[PDB]
């Protein structure tokens, strides 16, 4: 009923008289496909350069629970990429290695120091040497990563 023209009579000519008004798709600028069995609509969370991914992803995963109730019936959010999963694996790997070395060093610095108190000296040289580093990083701004832990 967008008016285009009207006679003195009062008989108007509407947009419907020269056009069909339909609901269609806009020009796609990007297409997303899932598992090779359907086109889908997706969303990607983008982190502010220099901030913490792991920290952010948790807030995201939790907010999504708050919304599972608010979501339309039948709507499913299937995750297609999660940088959080690699982080956990990477930090558990360096942690594990840090534990193995410690113990393997202890056992070794305990088979050349045949007294237990002697071994427990070179041993308590690590949990302390650790703390000082971690305490330092907090004054520096160095979070924990395979590279900061690798050192």
């Amino acid at each position: 009923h967008i008016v285009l023209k009207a006679s003195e009579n009062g008989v108007p000519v509407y947009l419907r008289d020269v056009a069909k008004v339909q609901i269609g798709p806009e020009m796609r600028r990007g297409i997303a496909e899932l598992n090779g069995e359907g086109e889908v609509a997706g969303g990607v969370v983008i982190l502010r350069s220099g901030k913490n991914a792991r920290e952010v992803i948790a807030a995201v995963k939790d907010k999504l629970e708050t919304l599972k109730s608010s979501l339309p019936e039948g709507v499913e959010i299937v995750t297609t990429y999660d940088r959080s999963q690699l982080i956990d694996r990477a930090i558990d790997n360096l942690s594990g290695k840090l534990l193995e070395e410690f113990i393997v060093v202890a056992v070794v610095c305990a088979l050349f120091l045949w007294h237990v108190r002697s071994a427990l000296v070179a041993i308590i040289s690590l949990p302390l040497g650790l703390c000082i580093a971690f305490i330092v990083m907090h004054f520096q701004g160095l979070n924990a990563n395979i590279m900061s832990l690798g050192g």
Binding site: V21, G30, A53, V56, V75
Partner: protein, 150 residues
Amino acid sequence: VQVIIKTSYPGQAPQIVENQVTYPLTTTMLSVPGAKTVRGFSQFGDSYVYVIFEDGTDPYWARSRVLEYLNQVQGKLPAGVSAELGPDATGVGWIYEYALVDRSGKHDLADLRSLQDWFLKYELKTIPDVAEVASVGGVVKEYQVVIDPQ
């Protein structure tokens, strides 16, 4: 450190986007304090300018710098067009990515894109350290007035 400058020049050919938007934009961003390299993308109606800053440059200094240069270049651009400042992140910032699917059929591509654009995007962007929640794929509902020439 990377600051993006996206300019839209609707309907204009790549070669025209370059001559009137991108090129004039990259040449001024090159002479920006701390600029190492500048990459330009001239597409059909789009102009992406990527400004890379040298090592040890304060990220927010670089931004506040590009902004002032944008001001003294806005006039050197075609009437309609305006140089937009990109998000505070980069391609690397792509952290968590998901797909929206309704297997029953109750909702379609358009409905889901709307769900994303007008619900999820705003439920997530309010999260700290998140710079942008971009919609990928889907259909944008369009009111198509199709004219009969006859």
